[PDB]
Amino acid sequence: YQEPTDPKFPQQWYLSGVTQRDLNVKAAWAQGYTGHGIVVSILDDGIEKNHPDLAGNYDPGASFDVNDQDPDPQPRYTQMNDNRHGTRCAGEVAAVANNGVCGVGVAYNARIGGVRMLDGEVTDAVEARSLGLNPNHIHIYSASWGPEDDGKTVDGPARLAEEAFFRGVSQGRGGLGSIFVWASGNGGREHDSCNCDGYTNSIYTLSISSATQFGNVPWYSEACSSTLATTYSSGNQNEKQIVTTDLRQKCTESHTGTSASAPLAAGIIALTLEANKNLTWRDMQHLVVQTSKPAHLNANDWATNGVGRKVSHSYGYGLLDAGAMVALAQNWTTVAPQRKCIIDILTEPKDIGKRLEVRKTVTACLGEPNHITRLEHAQARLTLSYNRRGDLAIHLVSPMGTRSTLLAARPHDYSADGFNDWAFMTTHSWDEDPSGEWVLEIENTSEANNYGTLTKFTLVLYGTASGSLVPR
Numbered sequence: 001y002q003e004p005t006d007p008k009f010p011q012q013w014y015l016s017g018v019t020q021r022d023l024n025v026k027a028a029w030a031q032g033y034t035g036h037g038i039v040v041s042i043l044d045d046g047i048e049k050n051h052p053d054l055a056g057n058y059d060p061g062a063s064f065d066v067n068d069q070d071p072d073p074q075p076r077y078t079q080m081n082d083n084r085h086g087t088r089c090a091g092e093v094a095a096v097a098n099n100g101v102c103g104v105g106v107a108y109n110a111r112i113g114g115v116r117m118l119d120g121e122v123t124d125a126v127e128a129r130s131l132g133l134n135p136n137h138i139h140i141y142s143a144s145w146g147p148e149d150d151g152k153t154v155d156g157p158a159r160l161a162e163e164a165f166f167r168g169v170s171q172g173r174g175g176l177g178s179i180f181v182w183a184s185g186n187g188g189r190e191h192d193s194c195n196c197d198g199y200t201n202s203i204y205t206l207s208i209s210s211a212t213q214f215g216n217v218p219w220y221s222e223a224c225s226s227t228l229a230t231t232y233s234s235g236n237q238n239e240k241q242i243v244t245t246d247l248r249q250k251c252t253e254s255h256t257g258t259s260a261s262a263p264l265a266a267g268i269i270a271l272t273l274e275a276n277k278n279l280t281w282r283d284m285q286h287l288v289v290q291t292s293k294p295a296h297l298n299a300n301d302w303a304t305n306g307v308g309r310k311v312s313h314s315y316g317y318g319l320l321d322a323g324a325m326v327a328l329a330q331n332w333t334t335v336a337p338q339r340k341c342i343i344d345i346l347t348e349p350k351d352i353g354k355r356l357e358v359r360k361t362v363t364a365c366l367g368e369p370n371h372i373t374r375l376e377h378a379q380a381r382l383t384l385s386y387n388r389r390g391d392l393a394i395h396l397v398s399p400m401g402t403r404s405t406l407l408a409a410r411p412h413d414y415s416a417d418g419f420n421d422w423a424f425m426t427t428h429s430w431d432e433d434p435s436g437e438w439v440l441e442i443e444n445t446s447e448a449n450n451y452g453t454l455t456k457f458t459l460v461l462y463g464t465a466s467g468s469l470v471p472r
C-alpha cells in the first residue's frame, strides 16, 4: 500500500499526520481497508454528484431528492453557495484517491450518495423518508441536523422519524440494522446541552463530538452524556480545519463544526464494516466504546467509569481510532440480543424546590428474560414541572459510582414547560453491572426561588447478560 498522492492530502492533518494527533486512518488503509463494498449516504442539502472528486464513487442508489421529490440530489446553486454542506460532508467520507484532485475520503473506495432534504420545509415526513431511504442498500447514514442550537429548545424526532429509526435498526441492512451516525450539535456558544436534542440523545444514533487540532473542546461543542466518541474538526484561527470537496467542483480547506466530525466518523465506520460486514448496529457502538482513545484530548471532566474506561461529556470515550476499529472488528463475536429492563421508580410525586435526590436500589430484572448484568445505554425518563427549565441541572449516578450529567444548566432556557417523559440518555456506564443503588439528583443552580414537581422517573436499562471483558 502507498499513501495517497492527492495534492491536498498533506493538508488533511487528521489523516496524514505523523505526530499522534490524528484518527489513525493510514493504519487501516495499510491493513487493506478502504471502504470497498460499503455504501454511505449524507442526509443534508444535496450532493454535487458530478464533482471531480466524487463522481467516481457516486451511487444513485444511495441518493434521493426529498425536497423536490425526484431521484437527483444535485444541490440548488445560489450566489451565496448556501447548499454546499452536503458536498463537503460527502468528500470527507469518500472523496476519490490518487486522482490529482483535492484530498481523499476516509473511505476513499466506498460508494457515496446524498439525500437532498434540508433545502425546503423539513417536516417529520421529510426526515422519515430520508432516514428510511433504500435501507437494504445504504449501510451507513450521516446527519448533523436536529432542533435549533439556541440553548433553549427541547425537541427530537416526531412519530414518523422515530418509526424510521426503529425500522432502520431492526430490519435495515438485512436485519443487522442501519448505522445512523450523528453530530452532537453546534450550540456551544449558547451553552446548549445536547441531551435536549432527541436525535443525538437517541440510542439508535452513534453520536460524535469534535476536538480541535491542539486537542481542546471547540467553542461550538455541546457536552452531554449521550455522546459516544470524537473526531477532529475546526477550532481557533491558528488551528487547521477540514479539507474536502466543495460546491462548484472546488476544494475547501475551511470546513468546520461538529457537522464536519460526523462524516469522518461515518468513514471510519465504513472501513470497520468492510473489515466485518456482519456487525450489527449495536456491535458498532461496542467497537467504538472499546477502541476510542482519550489521550491528549483536554477536558476537566474526564472520569473513570465502573469498568475502568475514561469518559468525558465533551468527548464520550475519546477520539476514534480507525486502525484499532478495523483490527477489533475482524474477529468480533456478535453481541447477544438486546434486553430492556423497565423500572418505574417513584411511588409518589416529589417536590423539587432547591434540590431533590431520589435513591433507588434495583435488581435489573433479576430472574427475568430481560435481566441485565452488562449495561449498554441507560435512560432516566423524566416527567417534571418547573418554572424556569434552564436553571435545572440533573445528574444520574450508577451503582458503580459513575456520575452522568443528564442536563447541565442552560441560561437561555426560560421555558415553563418542563420535561414530558424526556428520555435523558447516558453511554457512560456501558458494560457496567446496573444492579444496586441508582441516584438521581435534580438541583436549582440559580439563587432564584424556583419551584416544581417530579411526577415520573422511569429507569430504562438496555444491555445483555453475557460476554464481559475484564475491566480496563
Ligand SMILES: C/C(=N\NC(N)=[NH2+])c1cc(N)cc(/C(C)=N/NC(N)=[NH2+])c1
Binding pocket: 085, 118, 119, 120, 121, 122, 144, 145, 146, 147, 148, 149, 183, 184, 185, 186, 197, 259
Ligand atoms: C439546526 C441544525 N442542527 N441542529 C442540531 N443538530 N441539533 C441544523 C444543522 C445543519 N447542519 C443544517 C440545518 C439546516 C440547513 N436546516 N435547514 C432547514 N431546516 N430547512 C440545521
Ligand SMILES: *[C@@H]1O[C@H](CO)[C@@H](O)[C@H](O)[C@H]1NC(C)=O
Binding pocket: 278, 334
Ligand atoms: C452473522 O452473525 C450471526 C449471529 O452471530 C450468525 O448466525 C451468522 O452466521 C453470521 N453470518 C456471517 C456471514 O458470518
Ligand SMILES: [Ca+2]
Binding pocket: 065, 068, 070, 071, 072, 073, 074
Ligand atoms: Ca432534484
Ligand SMILES: [Ca+2]
Binding pocket: 006, 053, 095, 096, 097, 098, 099, 100, 101, 102, 103, 104
Ligand atoms: Ca482526490
Ligand SMILES: [Ca+2]
Binding pocket: 147, 148, 149, 150, 184, 185, 186, 187, 192, 193, 194, 197, 222
Ligand atoms: Ca443542541
Ligand SMILES: [Cl-]
Binding pocket: 340
Ligand atoms: Cl425500546
Ligand code: NA
Binding pocket: 123, 124, 158
Ligand atoms: Na420537527
Ligand code: NA
Binding pocket: 155, 156, 157, 158
Ligand atoms: Na420534533
Ligand code: NA
Binding pocket: 182, 199, 200, 201, 202, 203, 204, 205, 206, 207, 226
Ligand atoms: Na445517539
Ligand code: NA
Binding pocket: 303, 304, 305, 306, 400, 401, 402
Ligand atoms: Na469511578
